[PDB]
Structures are given as C-alpha cells and as structure tokens.
Amino acid sequence: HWGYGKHNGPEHWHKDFPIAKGERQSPVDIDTHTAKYDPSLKPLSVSYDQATSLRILNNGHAFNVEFDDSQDKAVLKGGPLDGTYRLIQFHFHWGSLDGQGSEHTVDKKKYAAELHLVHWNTKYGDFGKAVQQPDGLAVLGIFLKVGSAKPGLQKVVDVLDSIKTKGKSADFTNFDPRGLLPESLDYWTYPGSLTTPPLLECVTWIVLKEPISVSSEQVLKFRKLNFNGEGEPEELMVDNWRPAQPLKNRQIKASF
Template identity: 60%
Template sequence: MNKWGYADHNGPEVWHELFPLANGDRQSPIDIITKAASYDPSLPPFNVDYDPSSAKLIMNSGHTFSVEFDDGEDKSVVRGGPLHGSYRLRQFHFHWGPCDDYGAEHKVDGRDYPAELHIVHWNSEKYSNFVEAAQKPDGLAVLGIFLKIGEHNKNLERVTNALDNINFKGKQSSFTNFDPSCLLPDCKEFWTYPGSLTVPPLLETVIWIVLKEPIEVSSRQLSRFRSLFSTTETDEIEPCCMKNNHRPIQPLKGRTVRSSFS
C-alpha cells in the first residue's frame, strides 16, 4: 500500500499497516450512544467568530475537497464548549458515501447520515502553527455537522458551484469572502469527546464537537460531491470518482462522551 485511500486495497481496513495509530485508544469517528452520553451543565455554548475575508481557496486533494483559510492570525476562531482559549480556523471539508443512505463518519445511536461536514481549527493560544498543534493532545478542534437529504441548501450553493473549477485531484481555485458559520444549524446543542483525525496519519489530537442538529442538502448537491475525480487529469489510469470517503466507526475504548444538553 503506497498510497492510502478508500478502496479495498488501500482503505480504512488496512490503514493500520502504515499508520499503527489506527488501532489507538482515541480513534474517530464513533457511534454516539445518546443514553450513555454524560450531560455536563458546566459546558458553555461554543461560539464561532469567522471573518469571511480569511477564506482563500478551494482544492481537490483526491480524497475530498476543502476550503482553506488564512490562519496566520486570529481572524476566524472558535471558542467555548469544551475548549480552553481560542482555536483558529484552518479549513473545512466533507465526507460522504456512494448513495444518499449513508456516508457520514459519526453515527448517533447507530443512525447513518448521508454526509458530514468537518470544520477544522487549531489551538493558536498554545502553539505556533497548525503542524505543531496537530501533534498535541489538545491541538485541534473539529466541528462535526451532519447533512441530511432535504431542501436545496442555498448557503452551500457557492461551494458546489466552485467544484466545476476543481474536478480533478490537485486542482485548486480562488475562493474568497465566505463565512462558514452560514453552514451551521440554528441549534447549537452538541456532544464532545477526545478523538483523532479520521484520515491518515490519524493523529489522536482532536477535541470533537459534534452538533446534534443536521443541516439539509439536496440529493443533487450531494451527487455533485461524488462526481469529483480522485485522479489527476494526466493520470494514465482510468479516471475515478470520489464515490465514498468515510471511515467506519471506531471503538470507544473507555472514553466519555459529554453532551451540552440533557
């Protein structure tokens, strides 16, 4: 396995061969069992303060697509919830499946959602940059938002329209003046737990904030995700679409999931 991916030969079932942390004690995603979650009344609401001017570009990594932000200063941050201090916005990306029935990474009481949005931040009060923070147990904070099939999502429209510019792996395009808080649901009840990146190198450095309420996306918008290519324009192999890019749930291994609501 010279490159990781989501196919049988290089997918999550064999990631441990190159990335032993795949079998670690705080891996993500998980199935959130609501009855087992511990209500923590001391958890304050989380607060996002995003500056649209920090949005820079949209890119196709071959595994997903992401919108990248200027994280050289505290223009766009998240605070509160389980976090101590400010965490600076780095990027957001999505995970999805081959159909509208499943594709999100986390589950709730075994329930599948068709896709999941991850908004990635790093601890800019304790660490000097994203790479350093990604090595520390409290280095990263990721907001996880479920997507469900429903009405056309007008707030997501700018993102899906921009996908025409990054159809192939390695492509990137300018993407400016965008506030990702428009993608958050109205209700900000959440679960939180200590976890990991859900893609290699699977570093166990993420404080997860998984929102209870999903946002709606149309089936047509979600199908646009799947039409992106995981191959480059110049690859000699047959072009391959990103039909599926989610990791299966991982064992909890004694961790406590806290909730901001009873």
C-alpha cells in the same frame, strides 16, 4: 498510498499508521442514551465574522476550503475548549448513496455526509505543532441530511466543476462559513483523532446534534468529483468516510 478503496482503505491504514488501532480513534458511534449531559460545559462560541477564505483544493481524498489562519480571524472557543482555536480549513465526507457518508453515527444512524471545520489551538503557534499535542485541534462536525437545498453551500457546489481531479485548485475568496451552520449549537464532545492518515490523537471533537439539510442535487455534485488526477482512469470521489472506531475508555458528553 492510502485511500478509501478495497486495497488501500481504512482496513489497511494500520500497517503504515499503527495509531489506527489506538486508544482515542475517530470517528465513533454516539449512543444518545449513554452520552451524559455535562452541566459544566459552556455554550460554544463560533466567531466566523472576519473569516477569510482563500482557495478550494481537490487533494485526492476530499476537497478542502482553506482559510487565512495568519491571525485570529475565524475562531472557535468555549464549550469543552480552553483558549482559542483558529479555523484553517473545512471539508466533507460523503457516500455513494444517501444512506451512508457520515463518519460519526448517532445510535448507529448514518447521515448522507459530514462537514468538518478544522481549527488549531493558537497556544502551539502553527498547525504542524498543534497536531503533535493532545489538545491541538478542535473539529466541529456537522451532519448533512438530504432535503431542502442549503443556500450557503451553493457557492461550494458551483466551483466543484473547476476542481474535478486530484491536485486541482481554484480561488475561493469571500466565502462565509456561517452559512453552513444549523440553528442550534447543541453538541456532543469527546477526545479523538484525525479520521484520515496520519490519524493523530490530537482532536477535541464537537459534533452538532442538529443536522443541516442539503438537496439531492447538491450532494449529486459532490459525487461527480474524482479521486484520480487529470488524464488518469476516472474513479468517482464517493464513500470517502472512515467507519466508527471502538470508544474504548472514553465518555461522550452532551451540552444539552
């Protein structure tokens, strides 16, 4: 029964998911002065040439664009990672206003939104097994600021009308996630968690330093989605972000 409201939001999650108060929760504030350059970090390898998108789903918390992860089609490797992580889905977190919406923050700065590209470690065979492992997932996080339109985002914006409410899905084949990336793959990395229930501590976070720019009209269309199901009272899908959690005994490493 979790969500983002006063009554079921992030301050409540710990009662059903006690790991909400654990030692490696996400997101976190990235203090750019405290993050250390780690000259031992490899460049990221983002291999999305054969990515096979299938479907877009409104799950009542966000929308997920789902990929065929039955083979090594779209993978993330290198950087802080050992082995091969397969893309399974991406989604966003966003605000009611342009001054909030990201989950990570940079020197306490909040971006308008944040893209998460979710990948699982192929050595665990399936996603459900991977989330039970401390190195099971790699999530590539990309900040969104409001400015110029992102052309590679418009096919997503265009289909949101068709998945307005919880449980609605649409075919979403032949979408190229390379169109969502910034120019630079410079990043921060730290060990953390899923940012929604069940809040499992299974994620190597890789957060790109360079935000992508989207237009006010693009983000306005995200804010027209609904948390509710069809024929229920309208609740706009906005402010689906968890705030920054304690860093505790963790160091954030910079690739640059």
